[PDB]
């Protein structure tokens, strides 16, 4: 395993190099939008982002050491959390707004169905990132933590437990990396531990948002007005709501 042999600096570099691109939406400020078409735009964007996410996951240290089945599972569990934290990160410097794309910056007024509650949570998370002055180096660590951690407890044999053991080792490495970054930023030991806790507690809120979003997405499918892409439908069904 090359993953467990990386230094904190190499881990940061590896994660930064693997960052996906910021995609554009089909939004047109001159075109009228319904709640349905607005959600059509976001669905379209998410679908495209998912493809880049899959190829990003392959570049997260340790991830390809896992079996195809385990990779599939982790992504099925973490996909919406990962999209959401990315959205929150992009929006950090736009108080009151969510930057879905460089050409699509929304406020809560453009939430109008049930998406409005979710927008509010996302906005609060961005506000929280801003309060903390979240750094890019810390963001990439957090994103990789989500990928590896979210599905780790919902996976057979004593052998199949070794797979889980490897993940925990990589997770520990990312913790080390976070601490390393804070130490470099001049934080005291007490401050390092406090900030690490603060960052990890955010992941609980991201899980919550993902769960709420997953339910709204399911209701959308059933209403059958906003067409979901095939990949999105399969990811959604993986959660069996």
């Amino acid at each position: 395993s090359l993953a467990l042999s990386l230094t904190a600096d190499q881990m940061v570099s590896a994660l930064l190099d693997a960052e996906p691109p910021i995609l554009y939406s089909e939004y047109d400020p001159t075109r009228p939008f319904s709640e349905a078409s607005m959600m059509g735009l976001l669905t379209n964007l998410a679908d495209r982002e998912l493809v880049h996410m899959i190829n990003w996951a392959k570049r997260v240290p340790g991830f390809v050491d896992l079996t195809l089945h385990d990779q599939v599972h982790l992504l099925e569990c973490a996909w919406l959390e990962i999209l959401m934290i990315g959205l929150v990160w992009r929006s950090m410097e736009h108080p009151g707004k969510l930057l879905f794309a460089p050409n699509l910056l929304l406020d809560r007024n453009q939430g109008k169905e049930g998406m409005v509650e979710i927008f509010d949570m996302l906005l609060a998370t961005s506000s929280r990132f801003r309060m903390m002055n979240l750094q890019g180096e810390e963001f990439v660590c957090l994103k990789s933590i989500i990928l590896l951690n979210s599905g780790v407890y919902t996976f057979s044999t004593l052998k199949s437990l070794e797979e889980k053991d490897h993940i925990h080792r990589v997770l520990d490495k990312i913790t080390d990396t976070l601490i390393h970054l804070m130490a470099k930023a001049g934080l005291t030991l007490q401050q390092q531990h406090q900030r690490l806790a603060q960052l990890l507690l955010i992941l609980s809120h991201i899980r919550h948002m993902s769960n709420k979003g997953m339910e709204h997405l399911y209701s959308m499918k059933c209403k059958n007005v906003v067409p979901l892409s095939d990949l999105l439908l399969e990811m959604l069904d993986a959660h069996r709501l």
């Binding site: 899959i54 190829n55 392959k58 195809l68 599939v72 099925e76 990949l231």
Partner: peptide, 9 residues
């Protein structure tokens, strides 16, 4: 399985 395939190529 779309996700399964994309993870392969």
């Amino acid at each position: 399985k779309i996700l399964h395939r994309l993870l392969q190529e």
